[PDB]
Amino acid sequence: IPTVIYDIYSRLLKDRIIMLGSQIDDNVANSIVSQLLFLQAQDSEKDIYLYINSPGGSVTAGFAIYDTIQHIKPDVQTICIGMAASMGSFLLAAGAKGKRFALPNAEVMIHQPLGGAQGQATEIEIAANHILKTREKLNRILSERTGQSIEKIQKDTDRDNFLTAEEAKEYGLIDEVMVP
Amino acid sequence: LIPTVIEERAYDIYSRLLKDRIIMLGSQIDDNVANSIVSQLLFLQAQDSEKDIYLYINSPGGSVTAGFAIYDTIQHIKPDVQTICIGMAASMGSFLLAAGAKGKRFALPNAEVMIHQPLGGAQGQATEIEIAANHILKTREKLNRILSERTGQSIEKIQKDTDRDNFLTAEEAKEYGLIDEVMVPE
Amino acid sequence: LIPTVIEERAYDIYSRLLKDRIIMLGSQIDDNVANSIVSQLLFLQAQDSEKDIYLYINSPGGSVTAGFAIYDTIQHIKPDVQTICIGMAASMGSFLLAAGAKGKRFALPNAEVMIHQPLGGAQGQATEIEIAANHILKTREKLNRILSERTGQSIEKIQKDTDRDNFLTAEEAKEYGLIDEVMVPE
Amino acid sequence: LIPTVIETTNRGERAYDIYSRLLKDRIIMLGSQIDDNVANSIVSQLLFLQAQDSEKDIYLYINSPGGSVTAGFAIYDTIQHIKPDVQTICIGMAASMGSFLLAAGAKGKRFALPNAEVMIHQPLGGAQGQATEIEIAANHILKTREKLNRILSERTGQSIEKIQKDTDRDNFLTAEEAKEYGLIDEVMVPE
Amino acid sequence: IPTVIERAYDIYSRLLKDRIIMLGSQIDDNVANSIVSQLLFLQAQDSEKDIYLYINSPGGSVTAGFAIYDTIQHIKPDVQTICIGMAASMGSFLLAAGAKGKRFALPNAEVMIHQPLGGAQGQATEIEIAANHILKTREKLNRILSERTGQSIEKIQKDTDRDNFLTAEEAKEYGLIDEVMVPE
Amino acid sequence: IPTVYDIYSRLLKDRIIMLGSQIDDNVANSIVSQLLFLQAQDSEKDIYLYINSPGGSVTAGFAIYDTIQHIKPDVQTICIGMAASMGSFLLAAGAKGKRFALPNAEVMIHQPLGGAQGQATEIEIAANHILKTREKLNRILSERTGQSIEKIQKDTDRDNFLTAEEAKEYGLIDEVMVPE
Amino acid sequence: LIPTVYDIYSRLLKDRIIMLGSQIDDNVANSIVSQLLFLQAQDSEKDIYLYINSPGGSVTAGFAIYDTIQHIKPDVQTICIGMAASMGSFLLAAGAKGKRFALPNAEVMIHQPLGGAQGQATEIEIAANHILKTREKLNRILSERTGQSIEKIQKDTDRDNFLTAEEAKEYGLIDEVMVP
Amino acid sequence: LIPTVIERAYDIYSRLLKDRIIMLGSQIDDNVANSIVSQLLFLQAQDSEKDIYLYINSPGGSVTAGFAIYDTIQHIKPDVQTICIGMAASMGSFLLAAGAKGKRFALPNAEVMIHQPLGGAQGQATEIEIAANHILKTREKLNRILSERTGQSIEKIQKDTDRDNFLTAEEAKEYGLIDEVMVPE
Amino acid sequence: IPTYDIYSRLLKDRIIMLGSQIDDNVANSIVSQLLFLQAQDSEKDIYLYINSPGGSVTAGFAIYDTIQHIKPDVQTICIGMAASMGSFLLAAGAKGKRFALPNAEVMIHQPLGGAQGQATEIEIAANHILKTREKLNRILSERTGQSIEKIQKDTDRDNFLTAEEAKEYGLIDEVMVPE
Ligand SMILES: CC[C@@H](C)[C@H]1C(=O)N([C@@H](C)c2cccc3ccccc23)C[C@@H]2N(C(=O)NCCCC(F)(F)F)CCC(=O)N12
Ligand SMILES: CC[C@@H](C)[C@H]1C(=O)N([C@@H](C)c2cccc3ccccc23)C[C@@H]2N(C(=O)NCCCC(F)(F)F)CCC(=O)N12
Ligand SMILES: CC[C@@H](C)[C@H]1C(=O)N([C@@H](C)c2cccc3ccccc23)C[C@@H]2N(C(=O)NCCCC(F)(F)F)CCC(=O)N12
Ligand SMILES: CC[C@@H](C)[C@H]1C(=O)N([C@@H](C)c2cccc3ccccc23)C[C@@H]2N(C(=O)NCCCC(F)(F)F)CCC(=O)N12
Ligand SMILES: CC[C@@H](C)[C@H]1C(=O)N([C@@H](C)c2cccc3ccccc23)C[C@@H]2N(C(=O)NCCCC(F)(F)F)CCC(=O)N12
Ligand SMILES: CC[C@@H](C)[C@H]1C(=O)N([C@@H](C)c2cccc3ccccc23)C[C@@H]2N(C(=O)NCCCC(F)(F)F)CCC(=O)N12
Ligand SMILES: CC[C@@H](C)[C@H]1C(=O)N([C@@H](C)c2cccc3ccccc23)C[C@@H]2N(C(=O)NCCCC(F)(F)F)CCC(=O)N12
Ligand SMILES: CC[C@@H](C)[C@H]1C(=O)N([C@@H](C)c2cccc3ccccc23)C[C@@H]2N(C(=O)NCCCC(F)(F)F)CCC(=O)N12
Ligand SMILES: CC[C@@H](C)[C@H]1C(=O)N([C@@H](C)c2cccc3ccccc23)C[C@@H]2N(C(=O)NCCCC(F)(F)F)CCC(=O)N12
Structure with missing residues (x-):
């Protein structure tokens, strides 16, 4: 990671740019949440810029970021x-209305959540109910953010669904493709 | 490891027992074990469709579908099993113990019987997990319904008593209706 | 592990069943299993080209090409199979269950039948992935077409019903046309 | 991985990693599995913050799947011991000891964001060896569960019997359900 | 394992022909199944002649041990x-299970008694179930040992709290065996 | 393996040889031995070679191929099931007019696979060897199918799956045995 | 490992030189994207110099870099x-027209994208369609940047195709070979 | 992982050390003992009269490492x-009991566990004998010191440490391992 | 193993081969062979070949006690070599009928073992292995004519003896010189 006279990412943070450039786990979420809180405290009115190049990851970690975005005063x-897949594409759609973008060759992928369960029948049932409720929660929010129905989101996320930047715009995941 | 007996014929000990209509279920129940036991049951029915068969159970259980292969074959054939x-009959082992001919299900006094709900796993997409969950729940309903019919206990009681590992003595298994008699030594 | 029976002649239990025209498909289907079953079918046809053969299926499935070795051999020989x-017939196992002679496909009441689409893999260059994808899609069409002919269901319905794991009871398998009869115990 | 922020003050600029910057404003991040190291760090931060100012509130962020019960109790007891409200x-998520610590915050000052997940369940453990050693371990984990349930009852207003029943297996709550349960006081809805 | 020819037998099968069963390993389900089968075979061959159970075993599974124990008590012949060598844990329990008056050791044989071993992981209630089960199992073992030795349950409990090694002569004094066979 | 003889030995008594696995040296040695045994038993009666094989070693395959051509009986x-790679080569090696498939059997043809590491000159030697091996295979396949060497080269460049009927049209087999 | 003067790479960044000297993954892309943004903010008119010694890597990571290059105002x-292979050679070709170079002994390699898929037939189909669309996207852009037809690019990338610096110039991947 | 505070720039543990607080928050091995011994020596040199505060959240560990800490506590002038x-188990609970009389505390939900020392030996009979004698002497040494610090007899300590013995904070006080449970205000 | 297999052929002539590490399986097999041979003929000598690095003490005692229990002289x-429990069993043969070939190696040393866990568990294991060593040394004293104190000293570490030194020690009665 190069230095400027700051490491490069810290230099970008000084200009209110946050980089979500990896798999989303708890550490990444904690860091992004902290950066959002820091930026709001520095200036509660100026926009924040969230860069997303991510294959997705933990749903709960993604929701930490999602809820923090909605909680703070600045528009994000x-x-x-590059790519926004799974929870990455969910966070892309979570940006301030009118201010969600992609570059022309960026790839957006949506699909249903993944998980696991082992043990007794009743434990498997609890895990199944939990992941199904989680999917309903995701689909409901995605519906509100895209303007698509919950039924359409359900159908379109049944398997891996790859969208071009332009298709993501038509879908309502983003507002604009920035052409060079 | 397995001794031979000579009666002129040479038999390993298990084959000698099979000649007297005794089948040994002495391991974890998987497809191989089920196939072997199913084959022995079919062989014995063909040898004599009226004489009783004796199924020894010392098993921690195992695959439910493999257990049902044995269960359905027991019920299908004419001889009483x-x-x-x-030793121990746990899980599908205890289910098979309860599957013997009414009046002819036994345990020795220090044998351990354990009943519990089925175990499994699933990973992948939400809808795949749902399918696996529905399947294992239906499997549990099927097991509980049959256990209810075989023991005389209600489905609601079976559900409650199999929620976690439930260890029974031979005498408790008799009181429960999983077996008919404890053979006390003379 | 596998007991012996003595009639002058000494047989393992499976060989004894084969003498009465019973073939046991009791494992995952791979090339070895297919070769053995194909050999048994050819042997039985040569012993008697008119008497029925009995194929027991307790299998989670396996290789599609191995399954087709068995399928084609069943259709090729003169005796009804x-x-x-x-227990269970899943995937290629359920395909082979459906391949038995019309009117002579059975299940016991607690047997589980599962149908789903074929599984595979591919890695390498884009064009290699394309070739592998085309191959598995053609394989699925071939399977679905044959299943349609054997069950009486449309190809479109088979496609829909095999999109994900679909578990059927013995009675549901009968209604579907995978089997002709559920053998209820007497 | 962890960005730096630079604040220019009148006696030379200061460089902080982001978490240290938050700690300066009395925010402590419990953002991982709870083990002894995490507990020691959080205990130290609580003691430091009390010494800096014994009257100002402390803010404990919880995004945690839980972990060690004794480590969780190190944090719990330190929260109750110090003068500032926590x-x-x-x-994100508060599960197991994480949800226990969520419920341990100052009354009226326990929150969740709307899509946060709260999970409660009974403690997990292990025991091997002789029968009497297994008995000792079993008695210990059963007493530990009673201790947890009693405290949860006091913090939520639910009976011990209800806590016992509701923690028998994994029980997932929405933020709103956690409020109704008494684990938190308020869901912060976005403005 | 050598062969002997009269018909060809491996040495263990030859001993089984003279009603000698060898329990010469750790006790697991396979060993128990084999020994149970041999006991049933021998009873069917002759319901009146004694059976001879050789024990050189460090013990093993309690339920497997009880398969053997209950089969011994069930059959008509005296065992x-x-x-x-050694009888430890379930091995020493089976040694004590032989027909009264017909439990022996050679002079340098080692007998060890101790409490059962086990494990449990998972939820508190699962640990409780496992603990209750192993405690009941210990009570069952101690009660039977009390009946077979003539020692009180309280003494058995105390003496099995930790590993307790006995000489053949001490095992006789304890009531685990009836006689030490001294060489002629 | 069931007894009647083990089942495979029983089939060998009726001049049926089973090639039902990956082709390696052990399999080739066994099949070569069976062919020699059968020729000695009867030099005029046909032999029946069953093929359900993903292929394997080229030199092992050639052991079988050359033994088939060497002996007097028609094979x-x-x-x-499947004949892939050297398996499909051996399928095509049967006596003219007596090469068959069942209707759902799969035939796959492709170029040989291999490996080489070390010095440039060692890599060159290995490359020349595998290229010569491919020429040898293609020339023989051309003679057995009636297709040109140029067409064989093109059609084996990548994995090429054929149905039984397509294998017949190609000249790899003479007839599809339809069920009666 | 990395000498100080600034570490050496940061010193080069001060003079608007960015080093892409490794396999392209998300971390590398995020760093390069950040450097490009930083440099544009420092001076939106001065050229940026992107050094490429890379075996390639992730296509989506490569597109993060590609799109950022085209998005910013400065010529890159x-x-x-050394070497530009796969996505490395794609990025080499993405430089400002007239300002794409190689040193005389540099190696350029072009080939089709690599990937994988396992699971159900329909999942394999989705993965195959995705990688085929990705290849079309790459080939179309390469056609625009080189002046070669899509059909020629398709043919020339079917297998590993190694070019000398001079051949890369003739192909249109670069504009000039810098002779010493 | 470990946050920084600015007054000078300190990691949080160093900041606590400036106020005479030492954290024993892990398994006790030689490294941990060396660090704690060094902190104790540093603090005594800074001020030989002011109290030191030793936080214990530890499952225990090496007996000799524990004795390095124990002896250093007793050697220095300041009260510790x-x-x-959280938890003080095994050598952790021994060190808890080693604090200055009247100044040994626990928080109400803290767990104290006492048991006999653990170890191992393999090799020749005479090597096993040497290892056995050593661990038995070590147990006698531990029990004698625990007796002096708690007021319990050696015979009672022996009996109560035969197996894992878990105590609540209040039970640890009754036992004499600590002097007071700090209840929250 | 060449073909009776060769070992079974030797057993027919009352020769038992102890040619490996002594564990429970080996002991069970040798005990069974001894019982079989006594039943075949209670008066004829048995011949026990020993080429063994030793092994389990309790397994060795299974063999030892069975030798002493049966009527035939063993x-x-x-x-080759008799080490540890192997050399103990060599010394256990019938008095006057313990032999070695001239280049055979005999090694004596103290028993080996292990213990882990609580102090009291280590104490129990230590007491057990010390009692086992006393039992071994007492029997070796009776069989060799050496004092217990001398056996203790000479087995403190690995002590290698030639066949002739083993004879002088009393572990064997005679070295069979080739004719
Ligand atoms: C400024 C109002 C809302 C935003 C409010 C709030 O909702 N939170 C949330 C995000 C929060 C974070 C962590 C722990 C919390 C514990 C309880 C309640 C809220 C918490 C913390 C937040 N606080 C700050 O953000 N302070 C400035 C810190 C700046 C910097 F990030 F450190 F640089 C503490 C004062 C407070 O009332 N809030
Ligand atoms: C002769 C009374 C008791 C000994 C009785 C019995 O309790 N069992 C038990 C041990 C038993 C074993 C295995 C499975 C069983 C299933 C149900 C009931 C008893 C079973 C089986 C036993 N049987 C035999 O022992 N038959 C001869 C066996 C010969 C040989 F071992 F094969 F060589 C079957 C007839 C029967 O009534 N019993
Ligand atoms: C005697 C009526 C029922 C019992 C009937 C039957 O249900 N099956 C079942 C168990 C069966 C087994 C294996 C494959 C099958 C395939 C199709 C239908 C039934 C099958 C086979 C069974 N058959 C035999 O059991 N024959 C004797 C074999 C003796 C020995 F086991 F080999 F020793 C074939 C004649 C038949 O009509 N049945
Ligand atoms: C009886 C007519 C058809 C069935 C014909 C046939 O289609 N095949 C097939 C199944 C076949 C099998 C294996 C290799 C083959 C090679 C080439 C052609 C057919 C082959 C072989 C089959 N043959 C036999 O099955 N003979 C009896 C062997 C019985 C036993 F299995 F050994 F017990 C060889 C004589 C033959 O003309 N056929
Ligand atoms: C029968 C004429 C040709 C076929 C001739 C021949 O080409 N070979 C070849 C296949 C061969 C095989 C193995 C080693 C060889 C070594 C040198 C030359 C040929 C060899 C051996 C073959 N021979 C036999 O096949 N003998 C009978 C064996 C029958 C059975 F297989 F054992 F059942 C030895 C006599 C011989 O001249 N030939
Ligand atoms: C200057 C207009 C275009 C270039 C515009 C833009 O397109 N992006 C892009 C590259 C961008 C990056 C990261 C996150 C984003 C989130 C939403 C929209 C654009 C984003 C961010 C860019 N911004 C900056 O580049 N600010 C200066 C940062 C300098 C330094 F790198 F920190 F040194 C934020 C103000 C803005 O409107 N833009
Ligand atoms: C301020 C009153 C209570 C809170 C009191 C106390 O209970 N503890 C506790 C938490 C404590 C911590 C660590 C070791 C201890 C050892 C014995 C007793 C208490 C200990 C330590 C606490 N002390 C401090 O907090 N000093 C200031 C340190 C500030 C900074 F954290 F370093 F930044 C030591 C003086 C004292 O009497 N206490
Ligand atoms: C002041 C009397 C006692 C405390 C005396 C002593 O017993 N030790 C002990 C603890 C000691 C420590 C390390 C190595 C030793 C080697 C030999 C003897 C004592 C040693 C060292 C101790 N010394 C210091 O503590 N010096 C100040 C160091 C302060 C700081 F820790 F660096 F911050 C050296 C002068 C000395 O006589 N002692
Ligand atoms: C002269 C009697 C002493 C030798 C006596 C005896 O001490 N044992 C011992 C070795 C023995 C072995 C195994 C289990 C035993 C159980 C209880 C008592 C002695 C047992 C068994 C021994 N027996 C035999 O050795 N019988 C012949 C067996 C021949 C062959 F080994 F099979 F080839 C059983 C009859 C008996 O009374 N004894």
């Missing part, structure tokens, strides 16, 4: 550069 |  |  |  | 027991 |  | 030193 | 107050 |  603009 | 628990 | 599901 | 917020 |  | 071939 | 000059 | 937060 | 011969 989102941009997909 | 007597069951005895020696 | 009766099929019975005891 | 506000708690669930962001 | 004589001898400790050669 | 009939049948594909049941 | 590219030079191949 | 001890507090159990 | 002659012992060391060919």
